[PDB]
Write a protein that binds this ligand. Structure first.
Ligand SMILES: Nc1ncnc2c1ncn2[C@@H]1O[C@H](COP(=O)(O)OP(=O)(O)OP(=O)(O)O)[C@@H](O)[C@H]1O
Ligand SMILES: Nc1ncnc2c1ncn2[C@@H]1O[C@H](COP(=O)(O)OP(=O)(O)OP(=O)(O)O)[C@@H](O)[C@H]1O
Ligand SMILES: Nc1ncnc2c1ncn2[C@@H]1O[C@H](COP(=O)(O)OP(=O)(O)OP(=O)(O)O)[C@@H](O)[C@H]1O
Ligand SMILES: Nc1ncnc2c1ncn2[C@@H]1O[C@H](COP(=O)(O)OP(=O)(O)OP(=O)(O)O)[C@@H](O)[C@H]1O
Ligand SMILES: Nc1ncnc2c1ncn2[C@@H]1O[C@H](COP(=O)(O)OP(=O)(O)OP(=O)(O)O)[C@@H](O)[C@H]1O
Lengths: 362, 362, 362, 362, 362
DNA sequence: TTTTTTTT
């Protein structure tokens, strides 16, 4: 009998795998009898144990094929093709709705019975982040809607304040939530053309730590990047399409994606100040620092970095109506979980602890 | 049975598709039983719902093929082959006529039953455009004739004015109208080689915001652009063929397309000035700004960037006689539709509101 | 009859071989009659004499094959696929356990019947290393655990001391034990970006011989290393992912590995100082250089640079329960072997010889 | 009836051919009958006439094949695979053993029954070489052992001497004997890195007359060598692995091979002095040049840069016991020829003619 | 029935054709019936008419095959393979002897019944060129032998003089006579580094206007000749071999070919001067110009550029015994046919017309 | 494999 290339393509679709070697390696594991597969028995990896029993029969025949890499390439192409279609057709709401479904699937596993994570420790993260800025949950919801509508000029946000004020911590969580890339515009003017190539097909971008100049009078080290951004007007305004370049590839034309800019207290030209919708000032606070000392599991597990943390904040704080209609059904079930898991006094007491600078838990 | 490679080629032809991945993805959509196809039922994409029912049977057999990417490669080459045949055998007038027929097809959707656009909003955009320069519609018509005739050493128009005077706005609409590419000349002398490669087989090009030198007397930056263009004379002149380059690919040879140059008020070599046919000055105007502040749905929907808007302006203003004979029938039909939906007084009222800096739609 | 590709795939897996030529060459050796095979009789290479008999028949048929290289390419892909899967799914603690099993296999060879090394000479190396810093074994155990947990901010160790004070030596041994790469960051600021591409998918890095500035007052030749690091805080803190560049390749995004920093006695910014978990001071000591000078077989055999010496040290000093569960069996066997091969007085004397600076062995 | 691919593969192993074109060209010769093959009859080339009569029938069918280069590519892969195996499994002593057998095999034909050379000619070369520097054979034997043992630090000798000292001429013959390369450290230190990858996999290496980087102080043109090697220590001392690079290619790590520094008499830093076991400084000598001027034969056959002469120098002087154990028989089997045919007085006569600068032969 | 690939391969060997497009073009001509072939009847090209009848049958079937370029590729490889076998194995004299046979076979045709040129005009060319410098035939005989023996240092000669010195005229004729290749030395070296790959497998190479600062006294620009060659002294010496570039094929290790350098009478370093074991100075004379002016077929038919003219000159002047041995029957055959047709007095009077600047004919 | 990117 013969290999079903179809069953491989279904697995590649369902795992969303798009490295040929990873696809190859995964599929080969299934050739042993799932009935005794230790990975199955220990429930170690969903992409294995959910699928081993189904694909076992075909994996055995695949193991005898002489065409193995060809089968994988065709499968992987199917996954890549689906992404091209989606990018050229989905609405930005649907894109975001997909991204949330992916995160919610991880949370189902992660706070599942097999899952490692402690929902309490992750809720401690939410209390800390909600403390980082006034009206934090509203600020997130505003940012998200701004990215979805992607209204020209009204597109870009500025994070400003001294080193160790958490701005990159928040940027990373947002970037994890939406998907996107960091970029570094401090380069000399030539290499920028490949930097910007990273933006190709992304949903967000984040500009790291753009060094101004003259602020070294206040110990802020001088750099080029502010002048470069001052010269990247159309990329920021997003009004017309632009051409983007990768190594060994011909240029590609699209609307440059929206995003975030982060900096120390350099002085900003009014030309550039005009382009940001919103400036958010970050400032350091001792009680957060003292709390972190006592609450170190937050850092150890990277909780405060994680888009998973922000999604819990949204689920906790914001009305069911605000979420895209299809996932509202899942959202209700998560609100129901959290309501069972915490009384509001539990949550409030945590926030109080953080404000005291005491360890979050008591 | 076997896959019909012919039917796939037909689908590629009729969608004018020329990405192998997009084609593959699209064709695989059809493999599911047509009758339940939610994309069909919700009438989401004509590129799908027109074709699914027809292609379904062959799509199922295609889904089993071990050879899928080779089948798609042949179809994509057929679409590319037709483009090259046409590029070597059409008149410049015919090319523009075909391009216009395409925009007119897109307009059927925008204002059709699916009707996602509002024709009143898009007609508001035309009012703002007809304010941007004296005799705007006459200027557009003169440029179109210039591009069709393609008279050697009389092929290029110069736009200059302050920043925020409107240059790239108007270039963007002309470029969508005719089809073409933007190019950046502010580069080191090596990178120009691959950069100018982009012009291959295009109808227009636009050289974007060419930087001069000594412009700091006007608080401009300075850069390569002007001294660099002063070398590239024969590309402007278009009297003789030239040899054009792509990455990993051999030099093509053709006449370099006609086009537009944009800049701020750098001072220009009189030699380069003599190579331009026509210079158009742009100036900021307060009432356009105040009108825009009160009319921002123009920006939000990119109306004033869009080639559809320039086509609508021509249909409103120009005699049917000026249109190429084949499309005069469609032009007459669109004129009747516009005359039905708008009085002159309504259009006059809009234009008067713009002159007063009011929101257009009172 | 026909070639079994499966048998070649097994050999490639069992030998963990990932060069197509290395694989091809060795498999061809099996075609000659194993029953006489001088390599087998002289028990020279395990990867041969363990396998020759088993694979013999298939190797003979493979010797006739008309497509040999395609077989070997498929086999090598299978080995590479296993690495990709493991890279993405193992815990760091399992990676180290695997890294240990590999070395224990090679030790079973070195000190086995083939006897190509003397365990007593290697134990001399252990004693000399143990005297290089107080509580050396506890120091090494702490270092390994630190790399295994990879707790953010708590990630980097600093080695200071005069030249020829062993800091390179110990780093080399640790790197041989764990796997990883060195890096040089005394470069100018631009080319650092390609340098840091080295770290992609490594377990450790060593920033080797960072030049400071102004140390040249103590004849420490000055350079940009220190100031480059003081920019790189985000990579060191390890709290969020970063983008790494390779030549002719796209960026790739990951957590930046933990590592070690070595320098002569330059000054440090307090900012940089705060990023280190622990500082270790190296001082040159006369009895060590004199003992080396009278025990030079150590150097000649490159013993003291070798991770095998570190593994022997851990086994000698540290409890079985402290090792990962699976390998505790091999640990027990090796303890028993070493205990039988060395009474304490032997080791005590060897240490005391080092203490006297005389040749270790007298 | 069909081409045996195996017979072609044997011939490739037999010849050790590793160029697909050479293999193809030669094997096609065998299609004519060996019975009148004039190359066979005139005994022109062994790699033909030794094999034609065996391979004849297969070569006829080979000449009718349609796949000819495909057969030959597989055969070249076999020989390259063989090298890859040996290059990784053996140690330096067996490598040298095989290396000597190769040159001994050649001498066993050059002075063989063809008479196509007379060893007498080479003995004049041997005399000139033994006059070149004292105790010459022992200096070679010491260097050979030194480069075999590759003991750390003790890895480099410095040649020194002005133009026409012969230091290049010597290094050439040693590289002929060993295999290895020379390297231009006087390259500018940023580009220099892309040459260092030449050292990959090399048994032995040489540094080309390392220029004082302020060397023109001695009226010797300056170059980066001494600046670089003042710094780049353990590439020479070979204690630990270091990393090396090529243009458009990856880095690779190795122990940097042992070798020879050469210099014209530039200023040398103490760092760079410490690298050397030996710092042999030597002169152009007048009778030597006058000898060659009267002993032109030695240059006419390039003898004084051929390692074949060094092998003969060792064969004459060195005891049989000093050589690799099995080939000691071949050492006897040469000493029989030399010590028969040339008296030590005849040998001393040649050395004396050299010492007098007289034409070596009378 | 089917194409004989063997018969095609014979034609490629017969023609010594080694371009796959040329070969394909050639063979397809034969598909028409040779019996009426105009080219045959016209006796237009020997490469055709000698072969059309023989190959017609096979060409007819070749014309229908669906893989014609595969046949031609294998055939072309057979020709390239033959060259590689000869390249390594032949004596330099034997190579030169083959080259002469080829030229003599053309002279059979040129002065044959085809009679497409007259040895009258060519002998006028001989007479003209025998004026270019004293005893020209004898000077060439030295250059040939210097090249055949290829003795180290004794491998390069320098032509010197003004412009219009004929030095390129002489270089051209020698390169044709040998079948060498050409190179320009005067580049900034890292361009030339890859270009030098051309030198692979060549009997001879030549360098045009080896120049430098030694002519900027006369304000003639410093081409990097004198810059490069004092470094590249080894390549002129030819004492030792080196590795050389190609696209696609592996780098090839060879000695450099011996060759020629030329200059427009710049200075030379004495270090470099030593490599020009001859140097010869050339200066214009007006009567030679007037002769050309009155003998213009000398230039129009390129006679005075052509190696054929040198071969004619050597046949006239040199003794039969001075040639390579086996061709001397052909040497005698042409020496007869020459003096059979020319009295010395006519040849001498031709030379006297040249010396007078009279048109050679009478 | 080159090429474009590296490399400069
Ligand atoms: N608001 C805050 N007040 C005090 N400490 C803070 C605050 N935010 C962050 N921290 C501390 O600073 C550390 C680093 O935070 P983060 O990386 O986000 O700072 P940053 O100022 O945005 O950095 P950078 O500008 O270098 O990207 C945190 O791990 C935490 O210990
Ligand atoms: N003539 C104008 N008067 C007032 N506002 C204008 C005018 N033209 C453009 N604007 C405003 O400025 C924005 C920028 O327009 P655009 O980017 O085309 O102008 P530009 O700065 O002159 O062009 P470019 O970037 O090509 O040099 C417009 O979107 C509109 O909001
Ligand atoms: N503690 C020590 N006391 C004396 N000699 C030492 C000591 N440690 C190392 N050595 C000697 O120094 C040599 C070099 O060691 P190593 O490279 O590890 O030193 P280092 O301090 O890291 O030097 P550098 O920074 O100059 O590379 C060793 O091979 C040994 O000969
Ligand atoms: N000891 C010697 N006595 C006399 N002549 C010598 C001696 N050694 C070399 N020569 C002459 O010098 C020529 C160049 O030799 P070689 O390249 O080996 O010298 P080198 O000292 O390495 O020079 P450089 O520093 O210029 O590279 C030889 O071909 C030979 O003619
Ligand atoms: N001996 C000569 N007397 C007079 N004119 C000569 C002589 N030799 C050559 N010429 C003239 O010089 C012209 C060019 O010759 P050639 O190219 O060989 O010169 P060249 O010195 O090598 O030149 P360049 O340095 O420019 O390449 C010839 O066509 C001829 O007209």
């Amino acid at each position: 009998k013969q290999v079903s290339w179809k069953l491989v393509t279904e697995y590649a679709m369902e795992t969303k795998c798009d490295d040929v070697l990873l696809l190859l390696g995964m599929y080969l594991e299934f050739q042993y009898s799932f009935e005794m597969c230790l990975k199955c028995i220990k429930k170690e990896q969903p992409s294995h144990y959910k699928y081993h029993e189904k694909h076992y029969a075909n994996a055995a025949i695949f193991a005898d094929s002489k065409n193995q890499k060809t089968i994988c390439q065709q499968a992987v192409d199917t996954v890549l093709a689906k992404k091209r279609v989606d990018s050229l057709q989905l609405t930005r709401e649907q894109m975001l709705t997909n991204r949330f479904n992916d995160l919610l699937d991880r949370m189902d596993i992660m706070f599942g019975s097999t899952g490692s994570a402690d929902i309490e420790e992750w809720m401690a993260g939410v209390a800390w982040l909600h403390c980082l800025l006034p009206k934090m949950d509203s600020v997130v919801y505003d940012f998200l809607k701004c990215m979805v509508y992607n209204i020209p000029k009204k597109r870009y946000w500025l994070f400003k304040g001294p080193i160790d004020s958490g701005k990159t911590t928040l940027a990373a969580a947002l970037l994890e939530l939406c998907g996107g890339k960091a970029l570094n515009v401090n380069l000399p003017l030539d290499r920028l053309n490949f930097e910007l190539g990273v933006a190709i097909d992304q949903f967000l971008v984040v500009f790291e730590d753009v060094k101004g100049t003259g602020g070294e009078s206040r110990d802020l080290p001088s750099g080029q990047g502010i002048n470069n951004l001052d010269n990247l007007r159309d990329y920021l305004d997003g009004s017309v399409k632009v051409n983007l370049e990768k190594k060994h590839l011909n240029k590609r034309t699209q609307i440059f994606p929206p995003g975030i800019v982060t900096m120390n207290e350099y002085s900003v030209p009014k030309t550039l100040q005009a382009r940001f919708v919103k400036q958010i000032d970050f400032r350091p606070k001792d009680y957060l620092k003292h709390c972190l000392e006592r609450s170190e599991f937050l850092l150890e597990k990277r909780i405060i970095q994680s888009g998973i943390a922000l999604l819990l904040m949204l689920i906790w704080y914001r009305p069911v109506a605000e979420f895209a209609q299809s996932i509202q059904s899942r959202i209700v079930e998560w609100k129901e979980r959290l309501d069972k898991e915490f009384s509001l006094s539990v949550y409030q007491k945590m926030k109080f602890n953080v404000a005291m600078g005491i360890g979050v838990l008591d």
